[PDB]
């Protein structure tokens, strides 16, 4: 047992490992979020109508935060905003090109 | 409205984690018996079809690993973020090429 297969054989027990972590982290978010509500449930009684709804906030506020962590959406947000900047510099790029080619017509007979 | 909307929103995040669950769930199954299907047709094949046919069955997979844990994305911003810095030092070389010539011919 144990062969390469070109390194694919212990690709795909890396790849197993790495899927296998993720499944782990996504299960323990869904088990913690659920019990997270039995909890609130427990301890809404002797609350206020605003202590419910900050302790409850909390709660879904943590659960969302670790969904965006495993899932990229945060980091998607940060590309959009580097996209953005990228595209702006690049067309600065073109249009300072462009001034230094009319600087050359401007100064070619001096 | 409802504790504020916090219990709408709790069972709104609860169906998002749940999806992502049921995606990753899914992946693991294929995965394990993608190998199950290569193992089954891995003696009719020689060592170089073995690692091409391994090889698209790890490719499948971490494609779709990386789109769920949004390391696809991380890559991506790398490169975004290396190529804005280089615009950046080019805009400032641009600029002083600039300075440079107006002063070279403020005399013409």
């Excluded at 890396?14 to 909890?39: A, F, P, R």
Aim: glycine residues 4%; hydrophobic residues 30%; contains cysteine.
């Amino acid at each position: 047992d144990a062969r390469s297969v070109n390194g694919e054989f212990p690709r795909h027990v890396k790849l197993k490992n790495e899927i296998e972590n993720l499944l782990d982290q996504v299960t323990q978010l869904y088990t913690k979020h659920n019990s997270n509500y039995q909890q609130y449930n427990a301890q809404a009684g002797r609350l206020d109508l605003r202590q419910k709804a900050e302790y409850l906030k909390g709660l879904n506020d943590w659960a969302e935060r670790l969904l965006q962590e495993l899932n990229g959406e945060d980091v998607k947000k940060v590309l959009g905003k580097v996209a953005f900047e990228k595209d702006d510099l690049e067309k600065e790029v073109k249009e300072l090109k462009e001034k230094i080619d009319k600087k050359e017509k401007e100064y070619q007979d001096c």
